[PDB]
PDB file of C-alpha atoms in Angstrom:
ATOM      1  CA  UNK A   1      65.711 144.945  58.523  1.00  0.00           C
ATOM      2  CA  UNK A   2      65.790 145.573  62.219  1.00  0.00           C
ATOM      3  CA  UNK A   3      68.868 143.921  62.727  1.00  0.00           C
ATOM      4  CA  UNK A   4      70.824 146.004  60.688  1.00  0.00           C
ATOM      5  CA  UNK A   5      70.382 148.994  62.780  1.00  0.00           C
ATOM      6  CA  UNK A   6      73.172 148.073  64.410  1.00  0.00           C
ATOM      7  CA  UNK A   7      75.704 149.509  61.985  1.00  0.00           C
ATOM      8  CA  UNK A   8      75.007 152.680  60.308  1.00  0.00           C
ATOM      9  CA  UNK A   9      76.747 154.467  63.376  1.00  0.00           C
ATOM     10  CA  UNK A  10      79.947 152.519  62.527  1.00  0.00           C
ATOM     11  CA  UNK A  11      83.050 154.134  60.367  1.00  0.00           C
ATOM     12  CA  UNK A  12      83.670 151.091  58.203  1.00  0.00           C
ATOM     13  CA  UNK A  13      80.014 150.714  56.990  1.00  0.00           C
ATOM     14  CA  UNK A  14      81.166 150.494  53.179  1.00  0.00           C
ATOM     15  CA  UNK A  15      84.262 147.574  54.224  1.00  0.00           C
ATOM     16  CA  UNK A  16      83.870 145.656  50.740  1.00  0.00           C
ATOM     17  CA  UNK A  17      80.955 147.129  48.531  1.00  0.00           C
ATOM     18  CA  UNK A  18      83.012 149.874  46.452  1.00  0.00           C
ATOM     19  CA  UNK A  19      81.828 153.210  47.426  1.00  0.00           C
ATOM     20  CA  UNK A  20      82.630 155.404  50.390  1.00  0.00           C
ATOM     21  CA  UNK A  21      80.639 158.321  50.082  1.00  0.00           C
ATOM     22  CA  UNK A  22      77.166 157.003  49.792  1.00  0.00           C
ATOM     23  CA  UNK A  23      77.217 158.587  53.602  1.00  0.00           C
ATOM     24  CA  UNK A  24      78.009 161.913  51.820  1.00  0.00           C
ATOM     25  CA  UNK A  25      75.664 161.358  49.598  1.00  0.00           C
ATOM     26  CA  UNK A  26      72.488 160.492  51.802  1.00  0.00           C
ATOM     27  CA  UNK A  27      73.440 163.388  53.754  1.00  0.00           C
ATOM     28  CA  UNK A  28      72.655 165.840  50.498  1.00  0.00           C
ATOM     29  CA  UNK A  29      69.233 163.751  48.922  1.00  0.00           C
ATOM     30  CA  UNK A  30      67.160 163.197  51.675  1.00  0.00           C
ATOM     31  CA  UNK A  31      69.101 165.079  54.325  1.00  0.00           C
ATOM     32  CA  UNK A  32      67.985 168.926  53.939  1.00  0.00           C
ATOM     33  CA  UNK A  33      64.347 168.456  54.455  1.00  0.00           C
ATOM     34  CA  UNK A  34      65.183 165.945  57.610  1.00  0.00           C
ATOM     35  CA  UNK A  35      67.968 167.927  60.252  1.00  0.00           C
ATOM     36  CA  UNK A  36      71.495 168.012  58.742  1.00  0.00           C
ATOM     37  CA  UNK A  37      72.615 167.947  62.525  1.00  0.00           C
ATOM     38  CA  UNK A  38      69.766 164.772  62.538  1.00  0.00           C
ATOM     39  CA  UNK A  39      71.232 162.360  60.128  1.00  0.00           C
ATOM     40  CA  UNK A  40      74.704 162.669  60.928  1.00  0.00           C
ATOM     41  CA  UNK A  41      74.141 161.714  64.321  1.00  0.00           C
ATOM     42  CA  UNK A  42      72.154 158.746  62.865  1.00  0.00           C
ATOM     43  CA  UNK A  43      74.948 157.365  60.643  1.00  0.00           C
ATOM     44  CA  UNK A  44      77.888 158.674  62.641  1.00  0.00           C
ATOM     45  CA  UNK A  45      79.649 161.597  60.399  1.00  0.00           C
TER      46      UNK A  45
ATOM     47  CA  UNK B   1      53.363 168.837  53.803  1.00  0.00           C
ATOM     48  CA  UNK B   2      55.773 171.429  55.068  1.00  0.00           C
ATOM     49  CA  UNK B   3      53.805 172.293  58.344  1.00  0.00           C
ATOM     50  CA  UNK B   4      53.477 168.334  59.228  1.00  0.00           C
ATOM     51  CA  UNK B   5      57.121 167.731  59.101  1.00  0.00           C
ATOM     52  CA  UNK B   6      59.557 167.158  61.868  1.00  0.00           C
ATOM     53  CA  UNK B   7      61.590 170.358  61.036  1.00  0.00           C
ATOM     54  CA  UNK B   8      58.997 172.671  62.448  1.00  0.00           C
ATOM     55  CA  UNK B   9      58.949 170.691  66.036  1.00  0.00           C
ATOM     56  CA  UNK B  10      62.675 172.435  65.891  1.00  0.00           C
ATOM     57  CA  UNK B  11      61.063 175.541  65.654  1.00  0.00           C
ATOM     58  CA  UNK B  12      57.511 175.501  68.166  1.00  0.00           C
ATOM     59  CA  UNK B  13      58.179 176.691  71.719  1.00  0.00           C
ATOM     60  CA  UNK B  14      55.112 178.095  72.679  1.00  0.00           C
ATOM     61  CA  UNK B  15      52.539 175.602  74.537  1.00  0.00           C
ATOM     62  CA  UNK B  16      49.965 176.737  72.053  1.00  0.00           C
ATOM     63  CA  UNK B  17      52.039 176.513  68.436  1.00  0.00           C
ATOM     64  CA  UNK B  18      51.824 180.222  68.067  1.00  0.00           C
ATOM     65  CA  UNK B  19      55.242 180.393  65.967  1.00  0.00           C
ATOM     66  CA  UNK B  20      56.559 183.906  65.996  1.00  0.00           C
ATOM     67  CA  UNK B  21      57.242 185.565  62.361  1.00  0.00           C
ATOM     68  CA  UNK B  22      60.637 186.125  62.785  1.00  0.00           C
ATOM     69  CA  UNK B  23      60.945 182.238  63.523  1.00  0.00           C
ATOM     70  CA  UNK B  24      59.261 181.390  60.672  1.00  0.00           C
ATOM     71  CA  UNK B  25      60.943 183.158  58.370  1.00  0.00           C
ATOM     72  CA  UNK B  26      64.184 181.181  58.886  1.00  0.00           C
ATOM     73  CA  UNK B  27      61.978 178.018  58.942  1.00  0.00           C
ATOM     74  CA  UNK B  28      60.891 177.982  55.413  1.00  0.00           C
ATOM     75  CA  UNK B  29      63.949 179.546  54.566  1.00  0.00           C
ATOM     76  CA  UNK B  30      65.850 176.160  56.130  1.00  0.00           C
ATOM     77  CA  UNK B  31      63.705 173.543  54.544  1.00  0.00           C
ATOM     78  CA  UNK B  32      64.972 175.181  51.383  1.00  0.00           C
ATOM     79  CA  UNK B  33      62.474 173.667  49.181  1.00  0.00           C
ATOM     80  CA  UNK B  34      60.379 177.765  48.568  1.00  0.00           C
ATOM     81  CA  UNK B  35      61.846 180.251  46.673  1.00  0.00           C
ATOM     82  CA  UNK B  36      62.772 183.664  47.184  1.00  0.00           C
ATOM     83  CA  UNK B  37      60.266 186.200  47.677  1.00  0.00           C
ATOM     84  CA  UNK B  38      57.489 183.825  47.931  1.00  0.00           C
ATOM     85  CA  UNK B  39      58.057 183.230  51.305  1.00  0.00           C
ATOM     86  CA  UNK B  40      57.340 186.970  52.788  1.00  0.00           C
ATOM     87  CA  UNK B  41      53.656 186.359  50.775  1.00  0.00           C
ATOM     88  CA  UNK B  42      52.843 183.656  53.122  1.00  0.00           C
ATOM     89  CA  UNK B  43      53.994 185.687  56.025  1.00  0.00           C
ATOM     90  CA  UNK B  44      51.182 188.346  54.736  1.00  0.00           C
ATOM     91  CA  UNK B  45      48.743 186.060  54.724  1.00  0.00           C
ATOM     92  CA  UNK B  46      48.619 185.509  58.187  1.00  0.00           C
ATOM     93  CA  UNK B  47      47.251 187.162  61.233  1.00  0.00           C
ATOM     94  CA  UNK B  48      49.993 189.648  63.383  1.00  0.00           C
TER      95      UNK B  48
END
């Protein structure tokens, strides 16, 4: 676990797992309650 | 559940957490889970 902090903040975090928009969609689920300026710092959007 | 979230640390200024009513208002109205006019209830219930 703690070793993968290191990536969320990068722009290629989806590089071969098809998707590309599970950022956009962890910034809807569990992103309103939590600050919508909060999360996007913490994955970079 | 609401009240011991992290939105509302966004929201105290006061050294003793007296959160204005004009604050609070936009509060619940950003952690959109309330409805409509329920949230002007709760700001009756209080003390001015």
């Amino acid at each position: 676990g703690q070793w993968d902090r290191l990536v969320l903040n990068t722009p290629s975090f989806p590089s071969n797992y098809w998707d590309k928009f599970v950022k956009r969609k962890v910034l809807d689920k569990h992103g309103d309650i939590f600050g919508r300026e909060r999360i996007a710092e913490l994955l970079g959007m | 559940d609401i009240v011991g979230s992290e939105a509302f640390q966004d929201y105290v200024t006061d050294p003793r957490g007296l959160i204005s009513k004009k604050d609070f208002q936009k509060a619940m109205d950003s952690q959109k889970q309330f409805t409509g006019p329920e949230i002007q209830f709760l700001l009756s219930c209080s003390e001015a």
